[PDB]
Amino acid sequence: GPSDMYVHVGNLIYRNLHLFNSEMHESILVSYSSDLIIYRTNTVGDDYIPSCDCTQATYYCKHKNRYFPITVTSHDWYEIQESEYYPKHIQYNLLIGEGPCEPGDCGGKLLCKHGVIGIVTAGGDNHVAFIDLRHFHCA
Amino acid sequence: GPSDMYVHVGNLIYRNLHLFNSEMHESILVSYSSDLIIYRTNTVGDDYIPSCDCTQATYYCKHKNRYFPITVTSHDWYEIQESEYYPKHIQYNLLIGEGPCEPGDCGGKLLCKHGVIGIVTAGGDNHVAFIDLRHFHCA
Ligand SMILES: *CC(=O)[C@@H](CCSC)NC(=O)[C@@H](C)NC(=O)[C@@H](NC(=O)OCc1ccccc1)C(C)C
Ligand SMILES: *CC(=O)[C@H](CCSC)NC(=O)[C@H](C)NC(=O)[C@H](NC(=O)OCc1ccccc1)C(C)C
Ligand SMILES: [Zn+2]
Ligand SMILES: [Zn+2]
């Protein structure tokens, strides 16, 4: 679902870490260095995470309730500074292009021609960052 | 190294969660149910985790400072008892075979013919449990 702030492939859920409030489960994986939690759920999704290397993409902006086309660049690591909630740490496997960003936009799906490749994790003045989900998925 | 109590593949290191949870928020992956944690490091490792099948293997026992041949049984889960920390919990993605094990033996590598497939996580009456690192890796 285009407006869904999470990624759902099969029985798996890919979701921002701080967007988690729910129950502890056996299948829960957590990447503190990527603000990502992965777990299994009872329902099934139609999302698909490709094993590609695309950069010509598009993503969902929540506070505008619309999709922006975007060209992104892959970063091995990047200094993600400190906001009120969490400190200035290092986040691995990021995607970055220019685009609008405002609080409450995390989970916004980023897609290429093959499927969902990431979700909004942070942004700044006219630049937005995504978790590269391709790294946390098997071909 | 054969006596190294950790798996070190590429820029990633694999350790027991219940022993290295101090720097947890800086880790790149965590599985609370399987007692696994993964950190990044500058150095590059020689270790190799295969995507295979083997049940006939060998593992490093620190308190005897030598290797034991061992035949392991893949459990999807099993519940360990209570020591002087972490009361009787359940653990998932395990390998278990016959072999000596006393406190301080974890990280002891479990190798097959192809490479490393686990580290010691639990030990009891002539039985030692490993984490199935193959369940946490991509071919
Ligand atoms: C879900 C939520 O509320 C968002 C808010 C998005 S609005 C920006 N979560 C966040 O963690 C926000 C507060 N994070 C940040 O603003 C980053 N800022 C940042 O450096 O990103 C800009 C950037 C541009 C290009 C490459 C990398 C980053 C801070 C945590 C530093
Ligand atoms: C993994 C380690 O080496 C450390 C030593 C810490 S020393 C302060 N871990 C443990 O001691 C670990 C948490 N406890 C156990 O492994 C043992 N668990 C148990 O009773 O089950 C034994 C067993 C289970 C399944 C298969 C085979 C054996 C006890 C609690 C010491
Ligand atoms: Zn693609
Ligand atoms: Zn093998």
mmCIF file with all atom_site columns, N, CA and C in Angstrom, chain A residues 24-34 86 92 136-138, chain B residues 24-33 40 92-93 136-138:
data_model
loop_
_atom_site.group_PDB
_atom_site.id
_atom_site.type_symbol
_atom_site.label_atom_id
_atom_site.label_alt_id
_atom_site.label_comp_id
_atom_site.label_asym_id
_atom_site.label_entity_id
_atom_site.label_seq_id
_atom_site.pdbx_PDB_ins_code
_atom_site.Cartn_x
_atom_site.Cartn_y
_atom_site.Cartn_z
_atom_site.occupancy
_atom_site.B_iso_or_equiv
_atom_site.pdbx_formal_charge
_atom_site.auth_seq_id
_atom_site.auth_comp_id
_atom_site.auth_asym_id
_atom_site.auth_atom_id
_atom_site.pdbx_PDB_model_num
ATOM 1  N N  . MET A 1 24  ? 7.275  -8.482  22.022 1.00 0.00 ? 24  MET A N  1
ATOM 2  C CA . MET A 1 24  ? 8.533  -9.171  21.759 1.00 0.00 ? 24  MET A CA 1
ATOM 3  C C  . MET A 1 24  ? 8.259  -10.515 21.084 1.00 0.00 ? 24  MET A C  1
ATOM 4  N N  . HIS A 1 25  ? 8.992  -10.801 20.013 1.00 0.00 ? 25  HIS A N  1
ATOM 5  C CA . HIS A 1 25  ? 8.793  -12.028 19.253 1.00 0.00 ? 25  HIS A CA 1
ATOM 6  C C  . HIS A 1 25  ? 10.130 -12.730 18.993 1.00 0.00 ? 25  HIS A C  1
ATOM 7  N N  . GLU A 1 26  ? 10.072 -14.031 18.726 1.00 0.00 ? 26  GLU A N  1
ATOM 8  C CA . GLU A 1 26  ? 11.262 -14.827 18.425 1.00 0.00 ? 26  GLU A CA 1
ATOM 9  C C  . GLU A 1 26  ? 12.040 -14.294 17.221 1.00 0.00 ? 26  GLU A C  1
ATOM 10 N N  . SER A 1 27  ? 11.315 -13.810 16.216 1.00 0.00 ? 27  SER A N  1
ATOM 11 C CA . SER A 1 27  ? 11.918 -13.475 14.929 1.00 0.00 ? 27  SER A CA 1
ATOM 12 C C  . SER A 1 27  ? 12.460 -12.046 14.857 1.00 0.00 ? 27  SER A C  1
ATOM 13 N N  . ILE A 1 28  ? 12.299 -11.286 15.936 1.00 0.00 ? 28  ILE A N  1
ATOM 14 C CA . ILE A 1 28  ? 12.756 -9.899  15.958 1.00 0.00 ? 28  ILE A CA 1
ATOM 15 C C  . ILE A 1 28  ? 14.274 -9.762  15.775 1.00 0.00 ? 28  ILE A C  1
ATOM 16 N N  . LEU A 1 29  ? 14.661 -9.077  14.700 1.00 0.00 ? 29  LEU A N  1
ATOM 17 C CA . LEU A 1 29  ? 16.041 -8.663  14.463 1.00 0.00 ? 29  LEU A CA 1
ATOM 18 C C  . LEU A 1 29  ? 16.141 -7.152  14.605 1.00 0.00 ? 29  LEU A C  1
ATOM 19 N N  . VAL A 1 30  ? 17.198 -6.661  15.246 1.00 0.00 ? 30  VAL A N  1
ATOM 20 C CA . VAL A 1 30  ? 17.340 -5.217  15.404 1.00 0.00 ? 30  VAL A CA 1
ATOM 21 C C  . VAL A 1 30  ? 18.697 -4.691  14.970 1.00 0.00 ? 30  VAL A C  1
ATOM 22 N N  . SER A 1 31  ? 18.675 -3.694  14.094 1.00 0.00 ? 31  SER A N  1
ATOM 23 C CA . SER A 1 31  ? 19.894 -3.001  13.710 1.00 0.00 ? 31  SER A CA 1
ATOM 24 C C  . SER A 1 31  ? 19.913 -1.600  14.300 1.00 0.00 ? 31  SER A C  1
ATOM 25 N N  . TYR A 1 32  ? 20.499 -1.473  15.486 1.00 0.00 ? 32  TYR A N  1
ATOM 26 C CA . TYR A 1 32  ? 20.595 -0.183  16.156 1.00 0.00 ? 32  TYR A CA 1
ATOM 27 C C  . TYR A 1 32  ? 21.347 0.841   15.313 1.00 0.00 ? 32  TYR A C  1
ATOM 28 N N  . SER A 1 33  ? 22.330 0.368   14.556 1.00 0.00 ? 33  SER A N  1
ATOM 29 C CA . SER A 1 33  ? 23.106 1.230   13.676 1.00 0.00 ? 33  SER A CA 1
ATOM 30 C C  . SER A 1 33  ? 22.397 1.588   12.367 1.00 0.00 ? 33  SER A C  1
ATOM 31 N N  . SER A 1 34  ? 21.112 1.266   12.250 1.00 0.00 ? 34  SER A N  1
ATOM 32 C CA . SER A 1 34  ? 20.373 1.567   11.024 1.00 0.00 ? 34  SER A CA 1
ATOM 33 C C  . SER A 1 34  ? 18.932 1.971   11.306 1.00 0.00 ? 34  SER A C  1
ATOM 34 N N  . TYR A 1 86  ? 17.381 11.090  19.769 1.00 0.00 ? 86  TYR A N  1
ATOM 35 C CA . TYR A 1 86  ? 18.523 10.176  19.739 1.00 0.00 ? 86  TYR A CA 1
ATOM 36 C C  . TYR A 1 86  ? 19.836 10.883  19.367 1.00 0.00 ? 86  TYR A C  1
ATOM 37 N N  . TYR A 1 92  ? 24.974 3.009   8.996  1.00 0.00 ? 92  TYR A N  1
ATOM 38 C CA . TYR A 1 92  ? 25.562 2.327   7.847  1.00 0.00 ? 92  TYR A CA 1
ATOM 39 C C  . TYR A 1 92  ? 24.539 2.073   6.740  1.00 0.00 ? 92  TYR A C  1
ATOM 40 N N  . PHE A 1 136 ? 19.595 -5.873  3.889  1.00 0.00 ? 136 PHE A N  1
ATOM 41 C CA . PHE A 1 136 ? 19.022 -6.733  4.922  1.00 0.00 ? 136 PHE A CA 1
ATOM 42 C C  . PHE A 1 136 ? 18.091 -7.801  4.338  1.00 0.00 ? 136 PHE A C  1
ATOM 43 N N  . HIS A 1 137 ? 18.281 -8.141  3.067  1.00 0.00 ? 137 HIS A N  1
ATOM 44 C CA . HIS A 1 137 ? 17.406 -9.096  2.393  1.00 0.00 ? 137 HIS A CA 1
ATOM 45 C C  . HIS A 1 137 ? 18.216 -10.081 1.560  1.00 0.00 ? 137 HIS A C  1
ATOM 46 N N  . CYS A 1 138 ? 17.735 -11.318 1.464  1.00 0.00 ? 138 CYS A N  1
ATOM 47 C CA . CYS A 1 138 ? 18.425 -12.339 0.679  1.00 0.00 ? 138 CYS A CA 1
ATOM 48 C C  . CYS A 1 138 ? 17.805 -12.518 -0.702 1.00 0.00 ? 138 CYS A C  1
ATOM 49 N N  . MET B 1 24  ? 25.816 -2.266  22.728 1.00 0.00 ? 24  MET B N  1
ATOM 50 C CA . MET B 1 24  ? 24.746 -2.807  21.895 1.00 0.00 ? 24  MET B CA 1
ATOM 51 C C  . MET B 1 24  ? 24.183 -1.796  20.893 1.00 0.00 ? 24  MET B C  1
ATOM 52 N N  . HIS B 1 25  ? 23.972 -0.558  21.332 1.00 0.00 ? 25  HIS B N  1
ATOM 53 C CA . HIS B 1 25  ? 23.324 0.455   20.496 1.00 0.00 ? 25  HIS B CA 1
ATOM 54 C C  . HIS B 1 25  ? 24.182 0.908   19.316 1.00 0.00 ? 25  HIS B C  1
ATOM 55 N N  . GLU B 1 26  ? 25.411 0.406   19.271 1.00 0.00 ? 26  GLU B N  1
ATOM 56 C CA . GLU B 1 26  ? 26.362 0.724   18.215 1.00 0.00 ? 26  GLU B CA 1
ATOM 57 C C  . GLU B 1 26  ? 26.609 -0.498  17.325 1.00 0.00 ? 26  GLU B C  1
ATOM 58 N N  . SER B 1 27  ? 25.923 -1.596  17.643 1.00 0.00 ? 27  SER B N  1
ATOM 59 C CA . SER B 1 27  ? 25.998 -2.824  16.857 1.00 0.00 ? 27  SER B CA 1
ATOM 60 C C  . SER B 1 27  ? 25.224 -2.676  15.562 1.00 0.00 ? 27  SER B C  1
ATOM 61 N N  . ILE B 1 28  ? 25.540 -3.513  14.582 1.00 0.00 ? 28  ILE B N  1
ATOM 62 C CA . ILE B 1 28  ? 24.879 -3.435  13.283 1.00 0.00 ? 28  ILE B CA 1
ATOM 63 C C  . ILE B 1 28  ? 23.758 -4.479  13.159 1.00 0.00 ? 28  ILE B C  1
ATOM 64 N N  . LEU B 1 29  ? 23.662 -5.380  14.136 1.00 0.00 ? 29  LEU B N  1
ATOM 65 C CA . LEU B 1 29  ? 22.604 -6.395  14.157 1.00 0.00 ? 29  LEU B CA 1
ATOM 66 C C  . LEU B 1 29  ? 22.486 -7.092  15.514 1.00 0.00 ? 29  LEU B C  1
ATOM 67 N N  . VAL B 1 30  ? 21.252 -7.369  15.929 1.00 0.00 ? 30  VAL B N  1
ATOM 68 C CA . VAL B 1 30  ? 20.984 -8.019  17.209 1.00 0.00 ? 30  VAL B CA 1
ATOM 69 C C  . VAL B 1 30  ? 19.806 -8.988  17.107 1.00 0.00 ? 30  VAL B C  1
ATOM 70 N N  . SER B 1 31  ? 19.982 -10.189 17.648 1.00 0.00 ? 31  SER B N  1
ATOM 71 C CA . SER B 1 31  ? 18.902 -11.163 17.752 1.00 0.00 ? 31  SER B CA 1
ATOM 72 C C  . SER B 1 31  ? 18.739 -11.628 19.195 1.00 0.00 ? 31  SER B C  1
ATOM 73 N N  . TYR B 1 32  ? 17.803 -11.017 19.920 1.00 0.00 ? 32  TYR B N  1
ATOM 74 C CA . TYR B 1 32  ? 17.617 -11.298 21.344 1.00 0.00 ? 32  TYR B CA 1
ATOM 75 C C  . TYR B 1 32  ? 17.251 -12.747 21.606 1.00 0.00 ? 32  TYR B C  1
ATOM 76 N N  . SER B 1 33  ? 16.567 -13.362 20.648 1.00 0.00 ? 33  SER B N  1
ATOM 77 C CA . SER B 1 33  ? 16.101 -14.733 20.801 1.00 0.00 ? 33  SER B CA 1
ATOM 78 C C  . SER B 1 33  ? 17.206 -15.750 20.543 1.00 0.00 ? 33  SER B C  1
ATOM 79 N N  . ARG B 1 40  ? 30.620 -3.792  13.567 1.00 0.00 ? 40  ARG B N  1
ATOM 80 C CA . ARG B 1 40  ? 31.560 -3.452  12.503 1.00 0.00 ? 40  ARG B CA 1
ATOM 81 C C  . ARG B 1 40  ? 32.957 -3.270  13.085 1.00 0.00 ? 40  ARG B C  1
ATOM 82 N N  . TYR B 1 92  ? 16.657 -19.757 20.237 1.00 0.00 ? 92  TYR B N  1
ATOM 83 C CA . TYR B 1 92  ? 16.236 -20.207 18.917 1.00 0.00 ? 92  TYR B CA 1
ATOM 84 C C  . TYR B 1 92  ? 17.428 -20.305 17.971 1.00 0.00 ? 92  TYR B C  1
ATOM 85 N N  . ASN B 1 93  ? 17.230 -20.984 16.843 1.00 0.00 ? 93  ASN B N  1
ATOM 86 C CA . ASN B 1 93  ? 18.285 -21.213 15.853 1.00 0.00 ? 93  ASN B CA 1
ATOM 87 C C  . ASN B 1 93  ? 19.546 -21.831 16.463 1.00 0.00 ? 93  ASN B C  1
ATOM 88 N N  . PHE B 1 136 ? 21.869 -16.675 9.762  1.00 0.00 ? 136 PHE B N  1
ATOM 89 C CA . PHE B 1 136 ? 22.056 -15.225 9.804  1.00 0.00 ? 136 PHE B CA 1
ATOM 90 C C  . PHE B 1 136 ? 23.070 -14.746 8.767  1.00 0.00 ? 136 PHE B C  1
ATOM 91 N N  . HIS B 1 137 ? 22.964 -15.249 7.540  1.00 0.00 ? 137 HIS B N  1
ATOM 92 C CA . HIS B 1 137 ? 23.960 -14.950 6.514  1.00 0.00 ? 137 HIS B CA 1
ATOM 93 C C  . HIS B 1 137 ? 23.407 -15.143 5.098  1.00 0.00 ? 137 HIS B C  1
ATOM 94 N N  . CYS B 1 138 ? 23.996 -14.436 4.137  1.00 0.00 ? 138 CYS B N  1
ATOM 95 C CA . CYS B 1 138 ? 23.582 -14.533 2.739  1.00 0.00 ? 138 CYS B CA 1
ATOM 96 C C  . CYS B 1 138 ? 24.677 -15.108 1.842  1.00 0.00 ? 138 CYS B C  1
#
